[PDB]
Amino acid sequence: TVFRQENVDDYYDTGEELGSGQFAVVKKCREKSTGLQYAAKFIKKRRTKSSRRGVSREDIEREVSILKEIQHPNVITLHEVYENKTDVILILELVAGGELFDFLAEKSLTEEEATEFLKQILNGVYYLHSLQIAHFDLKPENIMLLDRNVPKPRIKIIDFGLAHKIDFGNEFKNIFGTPEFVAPEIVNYEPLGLEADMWSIGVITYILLSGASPFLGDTKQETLANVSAVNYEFEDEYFSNTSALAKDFIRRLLVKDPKKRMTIQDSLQHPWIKP
Numbered sequence: 001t002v003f004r005q006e007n008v009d010d011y012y013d014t015g016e017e018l019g020s021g022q023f024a025v026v027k028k029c030r031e032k033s034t035g036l037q038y039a040a041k042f043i044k045k046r047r048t049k050s051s052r053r054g055v056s057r058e059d060i061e062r063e064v065s066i067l068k069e070i071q072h073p074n075v076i077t078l079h080e081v082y083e084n085k086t087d088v089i090l091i092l093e094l095v096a097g098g099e100l101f102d103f104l105a106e107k108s109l110t111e112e113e114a115t116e117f118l119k120q121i122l123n124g125v126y127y128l129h130s131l132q133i134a135h136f137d138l139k140p141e142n143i144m145l146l147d148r149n150v151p152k153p154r155i156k157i158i159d160f161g162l163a164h165k166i167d168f169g170n171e172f173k174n175i176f177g178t179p180e181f182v183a184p185e186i187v188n189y190e191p192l193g194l195e196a197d198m199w200s201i202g203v204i205t206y207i208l209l210s211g212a213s214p215f216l217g218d219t220k221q222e223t224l225a226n227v228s229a230v231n232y233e234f235e236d237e238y239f240s241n242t243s244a245l246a247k248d249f250i251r252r253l254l255v256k257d258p259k260k261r262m263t264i265q266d267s268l269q270h271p272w273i274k275p
């Protein structure tokens with residue numbers, strides 16, 4: 001599918017850079033016609049079929065297709081798409097309070113503070129999973145705060161670059177995210193479903209409560225081996241005053257067999273979360 005090929009600079013002015021990764025850079029921008037503000041994500045295109053640099057058209061179109069489907073307070077929304085010879089430019093909702101990763105760095109949370117974030121994450125993922133969309137890259141860097149200077153910051157899930165529709169219960173694709181957060185089925189290159197996201201939520205929850213990462217080794221291969229072996233424990237130094245119910249919630253997510261792992265619906269009914 002083709003996107004708007006007018007120069008994006010004809011319609012938007014860019015400002016502060018919000019961040020960049022391997023194949024994308026995100027700039028704050030303002031639409032000339034409305035004065036409304038957005039985040040412009042410039043995704044570098046592949047320039048030959050067999051190249052390893054840039055993002056394939058198929059991968060860009062998948063991200064755009066998924067983004068076009070979603071409208072929920074806890075997920076980013078897509079406003080427009082432009083493209084030129086070098087980039088596809090997604091004009092996305094602006095979330096200006098920064099990464100959950102940075103919020104966590106600057107101050108571990110109480111169980112109340114953790115559940116305040118977690119409930120929003122769970123609500124966003126419930127929406128996604130209800131539409132059979134697996135995110136496949138859930139982690140604190142991909143959770144953005146609307147306003148970080150309130151006591152209970154609101155969040156939105158971002159970065160749908162690995163997201164897939166799961167119409168057949170699983171995808172068998174060599175999809176692979178950040179070692180610290182990927183489920184064992186990802187590490188083992190097995191068929192993947194919505195369950196992989198629930199593992200990631202377990203990892204996020206562990207980090208929220210402790211400030212420590214459950215499977216992190218000194219190298220990527222160590223982290224991956226730890227994940228596959230479910231090599232983690234609740235260190236007393238970190239978890240001594242954490243409730244047994246909170247640990248129960250995590251324990252039922254960090255389960256190797258995806259069929260035995262809590263689903264998103266299970267997580268919302270779990271006694272630690274259920275109102």
Ligand SMILES: O=c1cc(-c2ccc(O)cc2)oc2cc(O)cc(O)c12
Nearest residue numbers: 018019020021024026039093094095
């Ligand atoms: O640093 C990043 C920031 C954002 C982002 C996306 C939307 C916003 O409203 C605010 C920030 O998306 C990203 C997407 C990527 O694939 C990589 C990034 O670094 C970012």
Ligand SMILES: [Cl-]
Nearest residue numbers: 041158159160
């Ligand atoms: Cl994004």
